[PDB]
Write an enzyme that holds these catalytic residues in place. Sequence first.
Site, PDB file in Angstrom:
ATOM      1  N   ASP A 146     -48.738  -6.262  -9.036  1.00  0.00           N
ATOM      2  CA  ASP A 146     -47.493  -6.500  -9.777  1.00  0.00           C
ATOM      3  C   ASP A 146     -47.798  -7.079 -11.148  1.00  0.00           C
ATOM      4  OD1 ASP A 146     -44.702  -6.315 -10.155  1.00  0.00           O
ATOM      5  OD2 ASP A 146     -44.328  -8.286  -9.281  1.00  0.00           O
ATOM      6  N   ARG A 203     -43.882 -10.321 -17.238  1.00  0.00           N
ATOM      7  CA  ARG A 203     -43.082 -11.334 -16.550  1.00  0.00           C
ATOM      8  C   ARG A 203     -43.925 -12.217 -15.625  1.00  0.00           C
ATOM      9  NH1 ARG A 203     -41.805  -6.386 -14.427  1.00  0.00           N
ATOM     10  NH2 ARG A 203     -42.757  -6.031 -12.375  1.00  0.00           N
ATOM     11  N   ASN A 204     -45.107 -11.755 -15.211  1.00  0.00           N
ATOM     12  CA  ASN A 204     -45.981 -12.520 -14.323  1.00  0.00           C
ATOM     13  C   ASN A 204     -47.145 -13.179 -15.053  1.00  0.00           C
ATOM     14  OD1 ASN A 204     -44.429 -12.087 -12.018  1.00  0.00           O
ATOM     15  ND2 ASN A 204     -45.411 -10.116 -11.607  1.00  0.00           N
ATOM     16  N   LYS A 209     -43.082 -26.228  -7.517  1.00  0.00           N
ATOM     17  CA  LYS A 209     -42.201 -25.319  -6.790  1.00  0.00           C
ATOM     18  C   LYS A 209     -41.980 -25.850  -5.380  1.00  0.00           C
ATOM     19  CE  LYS A 209     -43.226 -20.992  -5.104  1.00  0.00           C
ATOM     20  NZ  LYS A 209     -43.394 -19.504  -5.053  1.00  0.00           N
ATOM     21  N   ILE A 222     -36.513 -26.328 -14.179  1.00  0.00           N
ATOM     22  CA  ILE A 222     -36.710 -25.210 -15.095  1.00  0.00           C
ATOM     23  C   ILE A 222     -36.388 -23.867 -14.467  1.00  0.00           C
ATOM     24  CG2 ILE A 222     -38.377 -26.467 -16.514  1.00  0.00           C
ATOM     25  CD1 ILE A 222     -40.613 -25.169 -15.135  1.00  0.00           C
ATOM     26  N   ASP A 278     -48.504 -15.143 -10.133  1.00  0.00           N
ATOM     27  CA  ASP A 278     -47.926 -14.321  -9.063  1.00  0.00           C
ATOM     28  C   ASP A 278     -48.968 -13.751  -8.109  1.00  0.00           C
ATOM     29  OD1 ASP A 278     -45.480 -13.112  -7.786  1.00  0.00           O
ATOM     30  OD2 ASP A 278     -46.500 -11.233  -8.283  1.00  0.00           O
ATOM     31  N   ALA A 331     -34.075 -22.307 -10.791  1.00  0.00           N
ATOM     32  CA  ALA A 331     -33.440 -22.474  -9.495  1.00  0.00           C
ATOM     33  C   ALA A 331     -33.581 -21.178  -8.714  1.00  0.00           C
ATOM     34  CB  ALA A 331     -31.962 -22.835  -9.648  1.00  0.00           C
ATOM     35  N   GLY A 332     -33.778 -21.316  -7.421  1.00  0.00           N
ATOM     36  CA  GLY A 332     -33.905 -20.192  -6.517  1.00  0.00           C
ATOM     37  C   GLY A 332     -33.091 -20.416  -5.252  1.00  0.00           C
ATOM     38  N   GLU A 333     -33.003 -19.371  -4.453  1.00  0.00           N
ATOM     39  CA  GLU A 333     -32.342 -19.402  -3.182  1.00  0.00           C
ATOM     40  C   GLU A 333     -33.191 -20.194  -2.227  1.00  0.00           C
ATOM     41  OE1 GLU A 333     -31.979 -15.612  -1.456  1.00  0.00           O
ATOM     42  OE2 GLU A 333     -30.824 -16.249   0.272  1.00  0.00           O
ATOM     43  N   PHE A 334     -34.517 -19.976  -2.300  1.00  0.00           N
ATOM     44  CA  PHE A 334     -35.596 -20.578  -1.452  1.00  0.00           C
ATOM     45  C   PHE A 334     -36.072 -21.946  -1.886  1.00  0.00           C
ATOM     46  CE2 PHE A 334     -38.557 -20.011  -4.902  1.00  0.00           C
ATOM     47  CZ  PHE A 334     -39.537 -20.929  -4.597  1.00  0.00           C
ATOM     48  N   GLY A 335     -35.778 -22.290  -3.101  1.00  0.00           N
ATOM     49  CA  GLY A 335     -36.267 -23.544  -3.629  1.00  0.00           C
ATOM     50  C   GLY A 335     -36.156 -23.530  -5.141  1.00  0.00           C
ATOM     51  N   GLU A 336     -36.713 -24.561  -5.767  1.00  0.00           N
ATOM     52  CA  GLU A 336     -36.605 -24.706  -7.210  1.00  0.00           C
ATOM     53  C   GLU A 336     -37.986 -24.894  -7.819  1.00  0.00           C
ATOM     54  OE1 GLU A 336     -35.078 -27.522  -5.335  1.00  0.00           O
ATOM     55  OE2 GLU A 336     -33.818 -25.874  -4.592  1.00  0.00           O
TER      56      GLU A 336
HETATM   57  C1  LIG Z   1     -45.517 -24.324  -9.452  1.00  0.00           C
HETATM   58  C2  LIG Z   1     -45.970 -22.942  -9.229  1.00  0.00           C
HETATM   59  C3  LIG Z   1     -46.086 -22.488  -7.947  1.00  0.00           C
HETATM   60  C4  LIG Z   1     -46.519 -21.212  -7.638  1.00  0.00           C
HETATM   61  C5  LIG Z   1     -46.802 -20.342  -8.659  1.00  0.00           C
HETATM   62  C6  LIG Z   1     -46.684 -20.756  -9.966  1.00  0.00           C
HETATM   63 CL1  LIG Z   1     -47.122 -19.641 -11.153  1.00  0.00          CL
HETATM   64  C7  LIG Z   1     -46.261 -22.041 -10.241  1.00  0.00           C
HETATM   65  N1  LIG Z   1     -46.179 -22.423 -11.536  1.00  0.00           N
HETATM   66  C8  LIG Z   1     -45.172 -22.073 -12.301  1.00  0.00           C
HETATM   67  O1  LIG Z   1     -44.289 -21.377 -11.905  1.00  0.00           O
HETATM   68  C9  LIG Z   1     -45.087 -22.430 -13.596  1.00  0.00           C
HETATM   69  C10 LIG Z   1     -45.943 -22.983 -14.446  1.00  0.00           C
HETATM   70  N2  LIG Z   1     -45.538 -23.204 -15.692  1.00  0.00           N
HETATM   71  C11 LIG Z   1     -44.307 -22.797 -15.970  1.00  0.00           C
HETATM   72  N3  LIG Z   1     -43.743 -22.899 -17.171  1.00  0.00           N
HETATM   73  C12 LIG Z   1     -42.481 -22.636 -17.465  1.00  0.00           C
HETATM   74  C13 LIG Z   1     -41.678 -21.814 -16.729  1.00  0.00           C
HETATM   75  C14 LIG Z   1     -40.360 -21.611 -17.115  1.00  0.00           C
HETATM   76 BR1  LIG Z   1     -39.057 -20.710 -16.287  1.00  0.00          BR
HETATM   77  C15 LIG Z   1     -39.888 -22.221 -18.185  1.00  0.00           C
HETATM   78  C16 LIG Z   1     -40.645 -22.988 -18.930  1.00  0.00           C
HETATM   79  C17 LIG Z   1     -39.991 -23.536 -19.991  1.00  0.00           C
HETATM   80  O2  LIG Z   1     -39.188 -24.320 -19.730  1.00  0.00           O
HETATM   81  N4  LIG Z   1     -40.192 -23.006 -21.152  1.00  0.00           N
HETATM   82  C18 LIG Z   1     -39.769 -23.356 -22.458  1.00  0.00           C
HETATM   83  C19 LIG Z   1     -38.318 -23.674 -22.568  1.00  0.00           C
HETATM   84  C20 LIG Z   1     -37.533 -22.459 -22.866  1.00  0.00           C
HETATM   85  N5  LIG Z   1     -38.015 -21.763 -24.050  1.00  0.00           N
HETATM   86  C21 LIG Z   1     -39.402 -22.005 -24.382  1.00  0.00           C
HETATM   87  C22 LIG Z   1     -40.176 -22.135 -23.120  1.00  0.00           C
HETATM   88  C23 LIG Z   1     -41.939 -23.231 -18.573  1.00  0.00           C
HETATM   89  S1  LIG Z   1     -43.655 -22.160 -14.481  1.00  0.00           S
END
Ligand SMILES: Cc1cccc(Cl)c1NC(=O)c1cnc(Nc2cc(Br)cc(C(=O)NC3CCNCC3)c2)s1
Length: 292
Positions: free
Chosen positions: A135, A139-140, A42, A15, A153, A17-22
Amino acid sequence: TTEIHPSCVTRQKVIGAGEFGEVYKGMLKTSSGKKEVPVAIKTLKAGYTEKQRVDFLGEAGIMGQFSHHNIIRLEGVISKYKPMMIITEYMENGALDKFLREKDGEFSVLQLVGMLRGIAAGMKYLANMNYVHRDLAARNILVNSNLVCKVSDFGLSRVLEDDPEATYTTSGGKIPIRWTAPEAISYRKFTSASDVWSFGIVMWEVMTYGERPYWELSNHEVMKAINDGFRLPTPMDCPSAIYQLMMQCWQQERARRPKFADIVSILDKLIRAPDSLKTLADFDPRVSIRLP
Ligand SMILES: Cc1cccc(Cl)c1NC(=O)c1cnc(Nc2cc(Br)cc(C(=O)NC3CCNCC3)c2)s1
């Protein structure tokens, strides 16, 4: 902080992609194999630096300190095996700013105010735990299937004493100034009261369905406007009480801003007596349409 065995984690879709990981959507087998839950995952790719490791695991360590409905829940980490992973609950609707921009005009005022109440409750919890976010922005915030908003975040640079990266984002970049209180911009004085200023900007983001604060103004133009006393104008269809509350979050004097407890209480009072939300602030039209 729970160490998870890699045999319990399956990754189904990328869902992000990053430079550091996905970042992946996946499943986590838990409760000794008797339960299975959707998760976000992540990774930290091979070759990461010591700093990248400390920051990565540090965010998980902080998240693991919290237990609140409006704060993203940590399931655990994989640190003994590679790639390292942080595993959280999966928020189906992703980041709040993008969600609102893809749902423009589709929610009621009461729904928008309810999102702000949830964010405020999460921030009240953080502030009372002596965590300053630095922050806070839409977006967060993440949004689940049931429209619950949760703060995300987090990073060690926010808690460690005199951290040389305390004024940066969790990625090491410059904290976007248009969410930041003047005393944090100018003097690096980040406190829960500067988070309150940021929350006011988040209120404006929510009520506008994800508009960019200050539109085309550059960062220096934003600083010029704020220090001249300009404030963001009311969103369209915005309750007067809601605009007044965001204006109070933007008081130049930080001691004059509401505390997060005040914000939660006011929002609760408005939701409970929804006729209070029918008085709308006048929207300043930016175009004159002359018709009969
Ligand atoms: C895993 C992790 C490590 C450290 C900090 C955090 Cl906050 C997290 N957790 C996360 O990043 C996430 C938790 N849930 C997430 N949900 C998410 C993120 C993203 Br980009 C996209 C989608 C997602 O696919 N969303 C649908 C598809 C596109 N349109 C409607 C929303 C869901 S990301």
